Protein backbone atom coordinates (compact mmCIF):
# COMPACT_ATOMS: atom_id res chain seq x y z
CA UNK A 1 0.00 0.00 0.00
CA UNK A 2 1.20 3.49 -0.83
CA UNK A 3 0.16 7.11 -0.55
CA UNK A 4 0.34 8.72 -3.97
CA UNK A 5 -0.27 12.34 -2.99
CA UNK A 6 -1.47 14.82 -0.38
CA UNK A 7 -3.37 18.08 -0.84
CA UNK A 8 -4.93 20.56 1.62
CA UNK A 9 -8.73 20.22 1.90
CA UNK A 10 -8.57 23.82 0.78
CA UNK A 11 -7.23 22.65 -2.59
CA UNK A 12 -9.53 19.62 -2.91
CA UNK A 13 -12.77 21.03 -1.51
CA UNK A 14 -13.20 18.04 0.82
CA UNK A 15 -14.91 18.72 4.17
CA UNK A 16 -12.66 18.56 7.25
CA UNK A 17 -13.58 17.25 10.68
CA UNK A 18 -13.05 19.32 13.83
CA UNK A 19 -12.24 16.63 16.38
CA UNK A 20 -10.91 17.48 19.83
CA UNK A 21 -8.24 14.81 20.28
CA UNK A 22 -9.18 14.08 23.90
CA UNK A 23 -9.21 10.45 25.04
CA UNK A 24 -12.41 9.12 26.57
CA UNK A 25 -10.30 6.67 28.63
CA UNK A 26 -10.03 7.22 32.37
CA UNK A 27 -8.12 5.26 35.00
CA UNK A 28 -10.66 2.94 36.64
CA UNK A 29 -11.25 2.04 40.26
CA UNK A 30 -8.85 -0.86 39.74
CA UNK A 31 -6.36 1.37 38.03
CA UNK A 32 -3.61 0.87 40.60
CA UNK A 33 -5.15 -2.39 41.98
CA UNK A 34 -4.07 -4.41 38.96
CA UNK A 35 -0.73 -4.26 37.16
CA UNK A 36 -0.13 -2.87 33.67
CA UNK A 37 1.92 -0.44 31.60
CA UNK A 38 -0.43 0.62 28.80
CA UNK A 39 -2.27 3.91 28.40
CA UNK A 40 -4.40 5.87 25.90
CA UNK A 41 -2.87 6.12 22.43
CA UNK A 42 -1.42 9.41 21.18
CA UNK A 43 -4.34 11.26 19.62
CA UNK A 44 -2.73 14.44 18.27
CA UNK A 45 0.63 15.67 16.99
CA UNK A 46 1.74 17.47 20.17
CA UNK A 47 1.08 14.85 22.88
CA UNK A 48 3.84 15.51 25.48
CA UNK A 49 4.70 11.81 25.29
CA UNK A 50 5.82 11.81 21.63
CA UNK A 51 9.50 11.18 20.95
CA UNK A 52 8.69 11.55 17.23
CA UNK A 53 6.78 13.35 14.52
CA UNK A 54 3.23 11.98 14.82
CA UNK A 55 1.98 12.28 11.20
CA UNK A 56 5.30 10.75 10.25
CA UNK A 57 4.56 7.74 12.41
CA UNK A 58 0.90 7.23 11.50
CA UNK A 59 1.78 6.88 7.82
CA UNK A 60 4.97 4.79 8.01
CA UNK A 61 2.66 1.75 7.66
CA UNK A 62 2.31 2.47 3.95
CA UNK A 63 5.52 0.65 3.10
CA UNK A 64 4.84 0.82 -0.63
CA UNK A 65 3.85 -1.51 -3.44
CA UNK A 66 5.71 -4.47 -4.93
CA UNK A 67 3.45 -6.30 -7.45
CA UNK A 68 0.60 -4.64 -9.37
CA UNK A 69 -0.50 -7.76 -11.23
CA UNK A 70 -0.40 -11.51 -10.39
CA UNK A 71 2.41 -13.85 -11.41
CA UNK A 72 1.51 -17.48 -12.20
CA UNK A 73 1.78 -18.52 -8.55
CA UNK A 74 -0.84 -15.99 -7.46
CA UNK A 75 -3.14 -16.99 -10.31
CA UNK A 76 -2.94 -20.74 -9.56
CA UNK A 77 -3.69 -19.78 -5.93
CA UNK A 78 -6.66 -17.54 -6.68
CA UNK A 79 -8.24 -20.39 -8.65
CA UNK A 80 -7.88 -23.07 -5.98
CA UNK A 81 -9.51 -20.91 -3.34
CA UNK A 82 -12.26 -19.89 -5.82
CA UNK A 83 -12.74 -23.52 -6.70
CA UNK A 84 -12.89 -24.52 -3.04
CA UNK A 85 -15.51 -21.78 -2.53
CA UNK A 86 -17.71 -23.17 -5.33
CA UNK A 87 -19.05 -25.99 -3.12
CA UNK A 88 -20.66 -23.27 -0.95
CA UNK A 89 -23.23 -22.41 -3.66
CA UNK A 90 -22.84 -18.71 -2.78
CA UNK A 91 -25.72 -16.36 -3.69
CA UNK A 92 -24.14 -14.09 -6.29
CA UNK A 93 -27.23 -11.94 -6.75
CA UNK A 94 -27.62 -8.44 -5.25
CA UNK A 95 -29.12 -7.87 -1.80
CA UNK A 96 -32.12 -5.71 -1.09
CA UNK A 97 -31.10 -2.43 0.50
CA UNK A 98 -33.41 -3.24 3.42
CA UNK A 99 -31.47 -6.43 4.18
CA UNK A 100 -28.16 -4.68 3.54
CA UNK A 101 -29.06 -1.96 6.04
CA UNK A 102 -31.22 -3.74 8.59
CA UNK A 103 -29.72 -7.21 8.61
CA UNK A 104 -30.77 -10.82 8.31
CA UNK A 105 -29.89 -13.85 10.40
CA UNK A 106 -26.25 -14.33 9.32
CA UNK A 107 -25.78 -10.69 8.31
CA UNK A 108 -26.03 -8.20 11.18
CA UNK A 109 -27.55 -4.73 10.78
CA UNK A 110 -25.31 -1.70 10.17
CA UNK A 111 -24.06 -0.43 13.54
CA UNK A 112 -26.00 2.72 14.43
CA UNK A 113 -23.41 3.29 17.18
CA UNK A 114 -20.52 4.18 14.85
CA UNK A 115 -19.84 6.99 12.41
CA UNK A 116 -21.65 7.36 9.09
CA UNK A 117 -19.21 8.16 6.36
CA UNK A 118 -17.87 11.21 4.65
CA UNK A 119 -19.50 13.80 4.36
CA UNK A 120 -22.04 12.84 7.00
CA UNK A 121 -19.75 13.05 10.00
CA UNK A 122 -18.37 16.41 8.86
CA UNK A 123 -21.92 17.78 8.38
CA UNK A 124 -23.13 16.49 11.72
CA UNK A 125 -25.49 13.96 10.20
CA UNK A 126 -25.88 10.72 12.13
CA UNK A 127 -26.70 7.13 11.27
CA UNK A 128 -29.76 7.22 13.50
CA UNK A 129 -30.78 10.27 11.47
CA UNK A 130 -31.11 8.00 8.43
CA UNK A 131 -31.73 4.47 9.74
CA UNK A 132 -34.61 3.18 11.88
CA UNK A 133 -34.82 -0.49 13.02
CA UNK A 134 -38.44 -0.10 14.03
CA UNK A 135 -39.46 0.93 10.50
CA UNK A 136 -36.74 -0.80 8.45
CA UNK A 137 -37.22 2.09 6.05
CA UNK A 138 -34.85 2.68 3.15
CA UNK A 139 -36.31 5.74 1.39
CA UNK A 140 -34.11 8.13 3.37
CA UNK A 141 -30.94 6.18 2.61
CA UNK A 142 -31.84 6.20 -1.08
CA UNK A 143 -32.31 9.93 -0.82
CA UNK A 144 -28.89 10.42 0.74
CA UNK A 145 -27.31 7.96 -1.64
CA UNK A 146 -28.77 9.81 -4.58
CA UNK A 147 -27.70 13.08 -3.01
CA UNK A 148 -24.01 12.41 -2.30
CA UNK A 149 -23.39 9.59 -4.78
CA UNK A 150 -20.84 6.84 -4.31
CA UNK A 151 -17.10 6.28 -4.19
CA UNK A 152 -16.74 8.83 -1.43
CA UNK A 153 -13.52 9.46 0.59
CA UNK A 154 -12.67 7.33 3.58
CA UNK A 155 -12.96 9.76 6.46
CA UNK A 156 -9.99 9.01 8.73
CA UNK A 157 -9.11 9.38 12.44
CA UNK A 158 -6.95 8.00 15.27
CA UNK A 159 -8.33 5.04 17.27
CA UNK A 160 -8.98 5.90 20.93
CA UNK A 161 -7.50 2.85 22.61
CA UNK A 162 -4.75 1.66 24.97
CA UNK A 163 -1.18 1.25 23.67
CA UNK A 164 2.10 -0.05 25.05
CA UNK A 165 4.48 2.67 26.17
CA UNK A 166 6.85 1.95 23.31
CA UNK A 167 4.02 2.33 20.77
CA UNK A 168 3.22 5.65 22.50
CA UNK A 169 6.72 7.13 22.39
CA UNK A 170 7.13 5.91 18.82
CA UNK A 171 3.72 7.40 17.95
CA UNK A 172 2.42 4.04 16.72
CA UNK A 173 -1.30 4.83 17.13
CA UNK A 174 -3.85 3.29 14.75
CA UNK A 175 -6.29 4.75 12.29
CA UNK A 176 -9.95 4.27 11.68
CA UNK A 177 -10.62 4.57 7.98
CA UNK A 178 -14.37 4.50 7.68
CA UNK A 179 -16.07 4.19 4.31
CA UNK A 180 -18.97 6.55 3.72
CA UNK A 181 -22.29 4.95 4.70
CA UNK A 182 -23.24 5.16 1.01
CA UNK A 183 -20.49 2.77 -0.07
CA UNK A 184 -21.04 0.57 2.99
CA UNK A 185 -24.63 0.05 1.84
CA UNK A 186 -23.79 -0.26 -1.84
CA UNK A 187 -21.05 -2.76 -0.96
CA UNK A 188 -23.30 -4.83 1.29
CA UNK A 189 -25.90 -5.02 -1.44
CA UNK A 190 -23.21 -6.41 -3.77
CA UNK A 191 -21.73 -8.95 -1.35
CA UNK A 192 -24.23 -9.32 1.49
CA UNK A 193 -25.12 -12.85 0.47
CA UNK A 194 -21.48 -13.86 0.38
CA UNK A 195 -21.18 -12.29 3.84
CA UNK A 196 -24.09 -14.36 5.07
CA UNK A 197 -22.56 -17.60 3.90
CA UNK A 198 -19.20 -16.71 5.41
CA UNK A 199 -20.76 -15.80 8.78
CA UNK A 200 -22.78 -19.00 8.76
CA UNK A 201 -19.81 -21.16 7.82
CA UNK A 202 -16.69 -20.19 9.77
CA UNK A 203 -14.21 -22.92 9.04
CA UNK A 204 -12.10 -24.67 6.51
CA UNK A 205 -14.10 -24.39 3.25
CA UNK A 206 -14.57 -20.64 3.56
CA UNK A 207 -11.16 -20.49 5.21
CA UNK A 208 -12.70 -17.81 7.46
CA UNK A 209 -13.07 -17.30 11.19
CA UNK A 210 -15.09 -14.13 10.91
CA UNK A 211 -18.17 -13.93 13.13
CA UNK A 212 -17.12 -17.05 14.97
CA UNK A 213 -17.86 -17.74 18.60
CA UNK A 214 -14.52 -18.80 20.14
CA UNK A 215 -16.40 -20.27 23.12
CA UNK A 216 -17.45 -23.05 20.71
CA UNK A 217 -15.47 -22.63 17.46
CA UNK A 218 -12.26 -23.39 19.35
CA UNK A 219 -13.27 -27.02 19.87
CA UNK A 220 -13.76 -27.41 16.15
CA UNK A 221 -10.28 -26.17 15.29
CA UNK A 222 -8.16 -29.16 16.27
CA UNK A 223 -10.48 -31.25 14.14
CA UNK A 224 -10.35 -28.89 11.13
CA UNK A 225 -6.59 -28.40 11.19
CA UNK A 226 -5.06 -31.86 11.44
CA UNK A 227 -1.42 -32.80 10.95
CA UNK A 228 1.36 -30.24 11.19
CA UNK A 229 0.33 -26.79 12.40
CA UNK A 230 1.97 -23.61 11.19
CA UNK A 231 1.40 -19.90 11.83
CA UNK A 232 3.04 -16.50 11.80
CA UNK A 233 2.37 -12.79 12.35
CA UNK A 234 2.19 -9.96 9.83
CA UNK A 235 3.72 -6.55 10.34
CA UNK A 236 1.04 -4.12 9.19
CA UNK A 237 -0.74 -6.61 6.94
CA UNK A 238 -3.47 -4.16 5.87
CA UNK A 239 -1.19 -1.33 4.80
CA UNK A 240 1.39 -3.67 3.31
CA UNK A 241 -1.02 -5.22 0.81
CA UNK A 242 -0.10 -4.55 -2.80
CA UNK A 243 -2.63 -4.01 -5.63
CA UNK A 244 -1.80 -7.47 -7.01
CA UNK A 245 -3.83 -8.85 -4.08
CA UNK A 246 -6.89 -6.86 -5.13
CA UNK A 247 -6.41 -8.16 -8.67
CA UNK A 248 -6.23 -11.64 -7.23
CA UNK A 249 -9.45 -10.99 -5.33
CA UNK A 250 -11.37 -9.99 -8.45
CA UNK A 251 -10.06 -13.17 -10.05
CA UNK A 252 -11.73 -15.21 -7.35
CA UNK A 253 -14.95 -13.24 -7.25
CA UNK A 254 -15.18 -13.71 -10.99
CA UNK A 255 -14.53 -17.47 -10.98
CA UNK A 256 -17.23 -17.90 -8.36
CA UNK A 257 -19.54 -16.04 -10.70
CA UNK A 258 -19.87 -12.46 -9.58
CA UNK A 259 -21.04 -9.84 -12.08
CA UNK A 260 -18.70 -7.18 -13.49
CA UNK A 261 -20.45 -4.37 -11.63
CA UNK A 262 -19.94 -6.17 -8.33
CA UNK A 263 -16.34 -6.81 -9.25
CA UNK A 264 -15.77 -3.10 -9.93
CA UNK A 265 -16.34 -2.30 -6.27
CA UNK A 266 -13.01 -3.91 -5.37
CA UNK A 267 -11.06 -1.08 -7.09
CA UNK A 268 -12.77 1.60 -4.99
CA UNK A 269 -11.09 -0.24 -2.12
CA UNK A 270 -7.71 -0.83 -3.71
CA UNK A 271 -7.59 2.80 -4.72
CA UNK A 272 -8.92 5.26 -2.11
CA UNK A 273 -9.07 8.86 -0.92
CA UNK A 274 -8.87 9.76 2.73
CA UNK A 275 -9.52 12.92 4.68
CA UNK A 276 -7.48 13.09 7.85
CA UNK A 277 -8.24 16.26 9.76
CA UNK A 278 -7.74 18.70 6.87
CA UNK A 279 -5.51 17.16 4.24
CA UNK A 280 -6.97 14.78 1.70
CA UNK A 281 -4.75 12.10 0.24
CA UNK A 282 -4.89 9.26 -2.28
CA UNK A 283 -3.89 5.77 -1.29
CA UNK A 284 -3.15 3.00 -3.76
CA UNK A 285 -2.89 -0.56 -2.48
CA UNK A 286 -3.46 -1.87 1.03
CA UNK A 287 -6.83 -2.40 2.71
CA UNK A 288 -8.67 0.26 4.72
CA UNK A 289 -9.98 -0.34 8.28
CA UNK A 290 -13.60 0.65 8.91
CA UNK A 291 -14.65 -0.68 5.51
CA UNK A 292 -17.42 -3.27 5.17
CA UNK A 293 -16.34 -6.83 4.48
CA UNK A 294 -12.90 -5.45 5.34
CA UNK A 295 -12.53 -8.50 7.56
CA UNK A 296 -14.02 -10.93 5.02
CA UNK A 297 -12.07 -9.54 2.05
CA UNK A 298 -8.87 -9.54 4.10
CA UNK A 299 -9.45 -13.12 5.12
CA UNK A 300 -10.20 -14.12 1.54
CA UNK A 301 -6.97 -12.44 0.40
CA UNK A 302 -5.08 -14.16 3.21
CA UNK A 303 -6.54 -17.39 1.90
CA UNK A 304 -4.89 -16.66 -1.43
CA UNK A 305 -1.63 -15.41 0.06
CA UNK A 306 -0.87 -18.54 2.09
CA UNK A 307 -1.43 -20.46 -1.15
CA UNK A 308 0.75 -18.37 -3.49
CA UNK A 309 3.34 -18.30 -0.73
CA UNK A 310 3.30 -22.11 -0.57
CA UNK A 311 3.41 -23.33 -4.16
CA UNK A 312 6.03 -20.69 -4.75
CA UNK A 313 8.33 -21.50 -1.85
CA UNK A 314 8.07 -25.23 -2.05
CA UNK A 315 7.72 -27.87 -4.70
CA UNK A 316 5.27 -30.78 -4.46
CA UNK A 317 2.80 -28.76 -2.44
CA UNK A 318 -0.71 -30.17 -2.74
CA UNK A 319 -3.16 -27.39 -1.99
CA UNK A 320 -6.17 -29.70 -1.41
CA UNK A 321 -4.29 -30.80 1.69
CA UNK A 322 -3.83 -27.33 3.11
CA UNK A 323 -6.23 -26.50 5.91
CA UNK A 324 -6.53 -22.86 6.95
CA UNK A 325 -8.79 -20.34 8.59
CA UNK A 326 -8.12 -16.62 8.55
CA UNK A 327 -9.44 -13.52 10.26
CA UNK A 328 -7.95 -10.49 8.56
CA UNK A 329 -4.24 -11.01 9.03
CA UNK A 330 -4.68 -13.68 11.74
CA UNK A 331 -4.00 -17.16 10.39
CA UNK A 332 -3.90 -20.78 11.51
CA UNK A 333 -3.13 -23.60 9.16
CA UNK A 334 -2.07 -27.20 9.07
CA UNK A 335 -0.57 -29.45 6.45
CA UNK A 336 0.46 -33.13 6.39
CA UNK A 337 4.15 -32.17 6.41
CA UNK A 338 5.94 -29.49 8.44
CA UNK A 339 6.19 -26.15 6.63
CA UNK A 340 9.22 -23.91 7.03
CA UNK A 341 7.97 -20.41 7.86
CA UNK A 342 11.51 -19.09 7.83
CA UNK A 343 11.35 -19.79 4.08
CA UNK A 344 7.76 -18.69 3.50
CA UNK A 345 8.78 -15.43 5.13
CA UNK A 346 11.66 -14.92 2.70
CA UNK A 347 9.46 -15.66 -0.31
CA UNK A 348 6.64 -13.64 1.23
CA UNK A 349 8.89 -10.60 1.53
CA UNK A 350 9.47 -10.59 -2.23
CA UNK A 351 5.76 -9.71 -2.31
CA UNK A 352 6.04 -6.81 0.13
CA UNK A 353 4.75 -8.76 3.11
CA UNK A 354 6.57 -8.66 6.42
CA UNK A 355 6.08 -12.02 8.12
CA UNK A 356 7.45 -12.87 11.58
CA UNK A 357 7.34 -15.74 14.11
CA UNK A 358 3.97 -16.55 15.61
CA UNK A 359 3.28 -15.22 19.11
CA UNK A 360 6.27 -12.88 18.94
CA UNK A 361 8.30 -16.10 19.15
CA UNK A 362 12.08 -15.78 18.83
CA UNK A 363 12.01 -17.76 15.61
CA UNK A 364 9.78 -19.88 13.42
CA UNK A 365 9.81 -22.83 15.80
CA UNK A 366 7.22 -25.57 15.66
CA UNK A 367 3.78 -24.24 16.50
CA UNK A 368 1.82 -26.80 18.52
CA UNK A 369 -1.56 -26.57 20.22
CA UNK A 370 0.16 -25.65 23.48
CA UNK A 371 1.67 -22.35 22.35
CA UNK A 372 -0.62 -21.63 19.38
CA UNK A 373 -2.53 -18.35 19.34
CA UNK A 374 -5.52 -17.10 17.30
CA UNK A 375 -7.66 -14.00 17.77
CA UNK A 376 -5.25 -13.40 20.69
CA UNK A 377 -6.36 -16.60 22.33
CA UNK A 378 -4.69 -19.87 23.14
CA UNK A 379 -6.07 -23.37 23.20
CA UNK A 380 -6.67 -25.06 26.57
CA UNK A 381 -8.33 -28.49 26.64
CA UNK A 382 -10.85 -28.83 29.45
CA UNK A 383 -9.40 -30.96 32.26
CA UNK A 384 -12.48 -33.16 32.63
CA UNK A 385 -13.66 -33.34 28.99
CA UNK A 386 -10.43 -32.97 26.95
CA UNK A 387 -12.35 -32.81 23.65
CA UNK A 388 -13.81 -29.47 24.74
CA UNK A 389 -11.32 -26.63 24.03
CA UNK A 390 -11.14 -23.45 26.11
CA UNK A 391 -10.40 -20.16 24.29
CA UNK A 392 -7.74 -18.60 26.54
CA UNK A 393 -7.33 -14.82 26.60
CA UNK A 394 -4.06 -14.05 28.42
CA UNK A 395 -4.62 -12.67 31.92
CA UNK A 396 -2.09 -9.95 31.11
CA UNK A 397 -4.44 -8.49 28.49
CA UNK A 398 -7.27 -8.70 30.98
CA UNK A 399 -5.15 -6.94 33.62
CA UNK A 400 -4.18 -4.21 31.16
CA UNK A 401 -7.82 -3.84 30.34
CA UNK A 402 -9.33 -3.55 33.84
CA UNK A 403 -7.22 -0.52 34.79
CA UNK A 404 -9.16 1.84 32.51
CA UNK A 405 -12.68 2.76 31.41
CA UNK A 406 -14.39 5.07 28.91
CA UNK A 407 -17.37 5.26 31.30
CA UNK A 408 -17.24 5.09 35.11
CA UNK A 409 -20.92 4.19 35.27
CA UNK A 410 -20.09 0.96 33.53
CA UNK A 411 -17.93 -0.87 36.02
CA UNK A 412 -20.30 -3.81 36.55
CA UNK A 413 -20.70 -4.68 32.87
CA UNK A 414 -17.03 -3.94 32.32
CA UNK A 415 -15.86 -6.43 34.97
CA UNK A 416 -18.19 -9.34 34.19
CA UNK A 417 -17.14 -9.12 30.54
CA UNK A 418 -13.58 -9.51 31.62
CA UNK A 419 -14.65 -12.41 33.80
CA UNK A 420 -16.40 -14.08 30.88
CA UNK A 421 -13.01 -14.02 29.24
CA UNK A 422 -10.93 -14.87 32.28
CA UNK A 423 -12.45 -18.08 33.64
CA UNK A 424 -11.44 -20.00 30.51
CA UNK A 425 -7.85 -19.90 31.87
CA UNK A 426 -8.80 -22.33 34.64
CA UNK A 427 -10.24 -22.28 38.16
CA UNK A 428 -6.90 -21.59 39.90
CA UNK A 429 -6.18 -18.42 37.94
CA UNK A 430 -9.81 -17.36 37.76
CA UNK A 431 -9.96 -17.37 41.54
CA UNK A 432 -6.70 -15.46 41.69
CA UNK A 433 -8.23 -12.87 39.43
CA UNK A 434 -11.50 -12.59 41.41
CA UNK A 435 -9.67 -12.50 44.68
CA UNK A 436 -7.60 -9.44 43.68
CA UNK A 437 -10.81 -7.88 42.33
CA UNK A 438 -12.48 -8.65 45.66
CA UNK A 439 -9.39 -7.18 47.38
CA UNK A 440 -11.01 -3.77 47.25
CA UNK A 441 -14.28 -2.43 48.73
CA UNK A 442 -15.76 -1.60 45.30
CA UNK A 443 -14.95 -5.09 44.06
CA UNK A 444 -16.88 -6.69 46.88
CA UNK A 445 -19.99 -4.70 46.10
CA UNK A 446 -19.79 -6.24 42.65
CA UNK A 447 -21.76 -9.20 41.39
CA UNK A 448 -19.04 -11.50 40.10
CA UNK A 449 -20.00 -14.70 38.21
CA UNK A 450 -18.98 -17.98 39.85
CA UNK A 451 -16.53 -20.42 38.18
CA UNK A 452 -18.44 -23.72 38.11
CA UNK A 453 -21.57 -21.86 37.04
CA UNK A 454 -19.71 -20.17 34.17
CA UNK A 455 -18.36 -23.57 33.12
CA UNK A 456 -21.74 -25.28 33.31
CA UNK A 457 -23.27 -22.71 30.97
CA UNK A 458 -20.42 -23.27 28.56
CA UNK A 459 -20.92 -27.05 28.63
CA UNK A 460 -24.51 -26.48 27.67
CA UNK A 461 -23.26 -24.94 24.42
CA UNK A 462 -22.20 -28.32 23.11
Amino acid sequence: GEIQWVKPNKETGRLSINGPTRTKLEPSVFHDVFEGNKEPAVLHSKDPRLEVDFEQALFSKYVGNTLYEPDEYIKEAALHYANQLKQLEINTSQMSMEEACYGTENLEAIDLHTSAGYPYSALGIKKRDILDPTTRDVSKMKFYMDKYGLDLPYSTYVKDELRSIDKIKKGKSRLIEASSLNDSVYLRMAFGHLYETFHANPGTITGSAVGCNPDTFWSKLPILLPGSLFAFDYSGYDASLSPVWFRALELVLREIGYSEEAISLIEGINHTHHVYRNKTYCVLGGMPSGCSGTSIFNSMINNIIIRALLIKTFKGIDLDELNMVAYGDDVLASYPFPIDCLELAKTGKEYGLTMTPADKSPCFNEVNWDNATFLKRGFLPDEQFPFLIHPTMPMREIHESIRWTKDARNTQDHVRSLCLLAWHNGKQEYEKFVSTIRSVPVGRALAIPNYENLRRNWLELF
Binding site: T313, F314, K315, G316, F337
Partner: peptide, 20 residues
Protein backbone atom coordinates in the same frame (compact mmCIF):
# COMPACT_ATOMS: atom_id res chain seq x y z
CA UNK B 1 -9.74 -28.42 -0.23
CA UNK B 2 -8.70 -29.70 3.18
CA UNK B 3 -10.48 -32.97 3.95
CA UNK B 4 -9.17 -36.34 2.78
CA UNK B 5 -7.69 -37.08 -0.64
CA UNK B 6 -7.14 -40.25 -2.68
CA UNK B 7 -5.77 -40.40 -6.28
CA UNK B 8 -3.25 -41.37 -7.21
CA UNK B 9 0.27 -40.96 -5.84
CA UNK B 10 1.85 -40.61 -2.41
CA UNK B 11 2.65 -37.15 -1.07
CA UNK B 12 6.21 -36.49 0.08
CA UNK B 13 7.79 -33.77 2.22
CA UNK B 14 7.59 -30.37 0.56
CA UNK B 15 10.78 -29.63 -1.39
CA UNK B 16 12.14 -26.08 -1.25
CA UNK B 17 12.06 -24.34 -4.67
CA UNK B 18 15.77 -24.04 -5.30
CA UNK B 19 17.21 -21.15 -7.33
CA UNK B 20 14.59 -21.44 -10.11
Amino acid sequence: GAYSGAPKQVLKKPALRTAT
